[PDB]
Subunit: 116 residues, 4 copies
Amino acid sequence: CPLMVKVLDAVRGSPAINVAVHVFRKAADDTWEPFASGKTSESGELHGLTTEEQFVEGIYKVEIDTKSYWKALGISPFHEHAEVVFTANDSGPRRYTIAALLSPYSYSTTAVVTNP
Amino acid sequence: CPLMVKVLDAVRGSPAINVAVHVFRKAADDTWEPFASGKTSESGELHGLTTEEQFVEGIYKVEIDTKSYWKALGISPFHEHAEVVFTANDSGPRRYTIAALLSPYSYSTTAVVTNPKE
Amino acid sequence: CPLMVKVLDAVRGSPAINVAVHVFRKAADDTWEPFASGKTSESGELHGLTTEEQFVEGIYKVEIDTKSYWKALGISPFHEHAEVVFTANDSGPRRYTIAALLSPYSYSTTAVVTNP
Amino acid sequence: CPLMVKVLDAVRGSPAINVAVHVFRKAADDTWEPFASGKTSESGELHGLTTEEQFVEGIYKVEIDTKSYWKALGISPFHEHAEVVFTANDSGPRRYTIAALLSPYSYSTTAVVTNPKE
Ligand SMILES: N[C@@H](Cc1ccc(Oc2ccc(O)c(I)c2)c(I)c1)C(=O)O
Ligand SMILES: N[C@@H](Cc1ccc(Oc2ccc(O)c(I)c2)c(I)c1)C(=O)O
């Protein structure tokens, strides 16, 4: 499982579940092509977006539908969505955990890059 | 100033100096159009991007070139850049401060929205 | 496992391993009595600090030896240590995950409070 | 000002107003002694805690009463308070800005250290 997403809610101290997430790969054109997609589980986690054969070196975009999540809660958010953009290079392709902690007016994100 | 940007560095505990920033407005054809550009000062601040008149209701994108900053320091960061996407001035005109705290594998961002003086 | 600690390194995008952690419980006197203690694993995690019988309602302190961690890396840190202080109340006692992301000059912390 | 505190609220995207702050200095008997006290202003800032003269080398503790702030809003937060512990002025005198970004179950803190003007 080369790419995983974890989202937490900072307002309630709990995972952020049923959060929509879209992954994009940079194309020739420099446009963005749809790649992988899901909704976070009960544990705020998303896995099995891709495989080690399909996940090659290149530029990816991870888009988190944060605004949908706050609306659902009756809270007016600042952000349209949270985007994370990185090169999936490093050594060669590896094990990426993209995590995001959310607040109505803020967000933090970190990457944990480990090889077993 | 209706739009102000503040960038800090978490590795050194100082302002992030000469950091490039690009602002875009979502166009009618649903395209991102260049709106304004600049670099952080000595205090990690960016002022004078726009005017109250110019800053109408819409969807804005603030892209911060975090990648070029870390490279200049000898670090190879994870992110290509930090982008902040929001709707502005949709319930009357406000003042926006977008702040970012940067690390090589992480970043945090918050906004302060204020109601102009009348 | 009523209380778990997870620590990540924001400079390197990896767990923060071999990080010393001390837990304290508020005493009668209002002093702090030693309670639980460990070192984070390879995954930056610490578990089995206590049991559901010993973990009763009260005030706890979680002290993370961050300065030791940066020194070891040849990096001069700001902080003497990172402290987290909370009431282990909520409903009755529950499932607490205390997480911390570290930078030489900053730190963020969040609590995830879930009941299975 | 050698020591300045800035607190922001992440739920509302505004400064954290009337937040109490207590500063301590580790004593010789290895006890925490009260050093200074105050409340954040309208801009979420706290100034005038101490003087260059008074602010000697030592170990300081900045305790922020985050618990009382959230209660005042109708929220029951996780933390009892936010504490920042650091060594100050140990390689000559500097200026310190401690900033905190607050949420009910989380907080983030960073420092900006500057070399005085001479
Ligand atoms: N546990 C995962 C990833 C993950 C996700 C969220 C986290 O908490 C925080 C705590 C504070 C923050 O600002 C942020 I962003 C995240 C942490 I620490 C780690 C793994 O290691 O595989
Ligand atoms: N001076 C600026 C804003 C500004 C900048 C950095 C800050 O610290 C932190 C501390 C933690 C964070 O995650 C972040 I993002 C910022 C804070 I609080 C506020 C203004 O008045 O608008």
